[PDB]
Amino acid sequence: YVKPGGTSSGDATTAYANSVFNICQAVTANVNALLSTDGNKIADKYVRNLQHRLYECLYRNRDVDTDFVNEFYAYLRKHFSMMILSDDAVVCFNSTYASQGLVASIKNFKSVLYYQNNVFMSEAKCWTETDLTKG
RNA sequence: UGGGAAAUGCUACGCGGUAGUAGCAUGCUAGGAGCAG
């Protein structure tokens, strides 16, 4: 037969490929969440200036810009920490930021998967934990 | 007339080598089993 696509199982680099794909999904959810917030009601200038610079570096500038890449990566490390196995993830994220939609949430992931993978994540499958004593 | 070396044995000490014994740690290999995505 002819396999249209998708990963096989019996090769040697499946776990690493899935991990990279997972990280890409998370980062693009964060980018989408940040750019769809009205800039007239943001917090201290820093983040709103960051949003402006982000749109510029995304759609206007042609080649790569190293410093802003470093800055955004540092921001993500500050407010969005991930531990990643092959397609299994746990995220510890600042809640007050996600309240105003400055970082990801489950609705952003649902939208990203719907338009980038052609599957519909049902929110009854994910889980959200408020306490930190229990892991 | 206020001058002494070696060959033998004993004992003690240390080193070296040899063997045997025991312990410790590790590195490899092989075998078998279990868990996870």
From Swiss-Prot:
The active site is at S86, D87, D88. It catalyses: RNA(n) + a ribonucleoside 5'-triphosphate = RNA(n+1) + diphosphate; a 5'-end diphospho-ribonucleoside in mRNA + GTP + H(+) = a 5'-end (5'-triphosphoguanosine)-ribonucleoside in mRNA + diphosphate. Residues 7-135 are annotated as: RdRp Palm C-ter. Its cofactor is Mg(2+). Inhibited by Remdesivir antiviral drug (GS-5734) through non-obligate RNA chain termination. Residues 1-101 form the RdRp catalytic domain. Interacts with nsp7 and nsp8 to form the replication-transcription complex (RTC): nsp12, nsp7, two subunits of nsp8, and up to two subunits of nsp13. Interacts with nsp9. RNA-directed RNA polymerase that catalyzes the transcription of viral genomic and subgenomic RNAs. Acts in complex with nsp7 and nsp8 to transcribe both the minus and positive strands of genomic RNA. The kinase-like NiRAN domain of NSP12 attaches one or more nucleotides to the amino terminus of NSP9, forming a covalent RNA-protein intermediate that serves as transcription/replication primer. This is RNA-directed RNA polymerase nsp12. The lineage of its organism: Viruses, Riboviria, Orthornavirae, Pisuviricota, Pisoniviricetes. The gene is rep. The chain holds residues 5066 to 5200 of 7096 of the full protein.
